[PDB]
Design an enzyme around this catalytic site. Structure first.
Site, PDB file in Angstrom:
ATOM      1  CG  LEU A   1      -2.029   1.021   1.430  1.00  0.00           C
ATOM      2  CD1 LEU A   1      -3.138   0.418   2.272  1.00  0.00           C
ATOM      3  CD2 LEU A   1      -1.506   2.280   2.105  1.00  0.00           C
ATOM      4  CG  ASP A   2       3.005   1.968   3.646  1.00  0.00           C
ATOM      5  OD1 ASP A   2       3.657   1.185   2.923  1.00  0.00           O
ATOM      6  OD2 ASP A   2       3.116   1.992   4.889  1.00  0.00           O
TER       7      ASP A   2
END
Lengths: 48, 80
Positions: free
Chosen positions: B59-60
Site C-alpha cells: 500500500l504505502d
C-alpha cells in the site's frame, strides 16, 4: 441435511439449541401409535 | 529566492501531509474490513494477518516516497 452440513462447515460460528444439547430438566417424547388394534403387541412393545 | 524556498517548504508539506492522508485512508479501510473478515473466519488468523501485512506493504510505498523527498528538499534542498 446436505446443504445444512454445507452451511455449518461454512459457518461453524455457533451451534443453536437445536443442534447441541443443553442440560435437561424435562425431556419430551413424541409417541406414535394406532387407533385400530389387532396388530399384535407391536404398539404394546413400543409402550413397554 | 527565499520565497522560492517558501515554495519548496509548501511543496514538501503538500507531499507529506497529503500522502499521509493516502495512508490514513488505505490502512483504515484495510483494518475495518480485516476485522470484519477475521470475525467471519476466526480460525485461520495467521494467514489472514500474513496477507494483511502483505497488502499493507504493497500500500504505502509512494506516499512515504513523497514524505521522504519532501523532507530531503526541506534539508537537502536542490538549488537552495
Amino acid at each position: 441435511r446436505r446443504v445444512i452440513a454445507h452451511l455449518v462447515q461454512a459457518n461453524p460460528e455457533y451451534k443453536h439449541r437445536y443442534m447441541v444439547d443443553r442440560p435437561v430438566k424435562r425431556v419430551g417424547y413424541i409417541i406414535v401409535s394406532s387407533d385400530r388394534g389387532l396388530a399384535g403387541g407391536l404398539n404394546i412393545n413400543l409402550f413397554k | 529566492m527565499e520565497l522560492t524556498l517558501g515554495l519548496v517548504a509548501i511543496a514538501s508539506a503538500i507531499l507529506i501531509a497529503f500522502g499521509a492522508l493516502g495512508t490514513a485512508i488505505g490502512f483504515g479501510l484495510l483494518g475495518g474490513r480485516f476485522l470484519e473478515a477475521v470475525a467471519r473466519q476466526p480460525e485461520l488468523a495467521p494467514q489472514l494477518q500474513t496477507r494483511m501485512f502483505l497488502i499493507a506493504g504493497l500500500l504505502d510505498a509512494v506516499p512515504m516516497i513523497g514524505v521522504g523527498i519532501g523532507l530531503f528538499f526541506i534539508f537537502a534542498n536542490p538549488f537552495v
